[PDB]
Write a protein that binds this ligand. Sequence first.
Ligand SMILES: N=C(N)Nc1ccccc1
Length: 245
Amino acid sequence: IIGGEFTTIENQPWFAAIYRRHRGGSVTYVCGGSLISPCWVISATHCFIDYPKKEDYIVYLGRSRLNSNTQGEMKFEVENLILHKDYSADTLAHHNDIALLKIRSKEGRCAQPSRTIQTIALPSMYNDPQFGTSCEITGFGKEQSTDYLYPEQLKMTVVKLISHRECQQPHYYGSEVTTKMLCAADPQWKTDSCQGDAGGPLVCSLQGRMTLTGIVSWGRGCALKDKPGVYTRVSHFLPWIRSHT
Ligand SMILES: N=C(N)Nc1ccccc1
């Protein structure tokens, strides 16, 4: 997250921190995800496409720090890693960038709600906030495009939804963005998601209900003029989610 503010897990209790084991046993951060139900975390396919093996991943819930445990956090194994079969990757635009991870602890249990662990509601089909609406994003991604390290403390910021016509414009992303995608950014391009934030949630208040409107997917650089963050439009993949869950 470029700009924005630091936060702890209680301000995004459905945020999931996903890591991967390497040969030798070293563990590195992979991407963010969102708990949509006790046993299910939704993320982005591009995060796992190069390493499809579910056994290599570890998922944490109620975790506020990148490399240090958070009191009360839960650790999970990935019982099933479901990627979207229609996934595609272009110059930058990832299509159908959505994935599902079925979590299971070593005790064979799913998530246990608490003050630091809760689920986020899915939107109604094809029901998104009006463009210009302010929503929030969360993640452990870079704080600066040139940074080498990722922040140790979770972060969040606010970005406004951009209309498809605006984003489809030449100056923006042209045709790289589709109806199954949502663009969002700061009117001053001061804050935005960045490398490491993929898979994370774009949450909007829709009719008094915090809703998982999008999933951090892609973008040209970070916090650059006319280059918004692009998000998987969740309200357009409900049938997919339904069946796979
Ligand atoms: N918001 C962005 N400009 N770029 C971006 C970078 C990395 C992941 C997701 C989105």
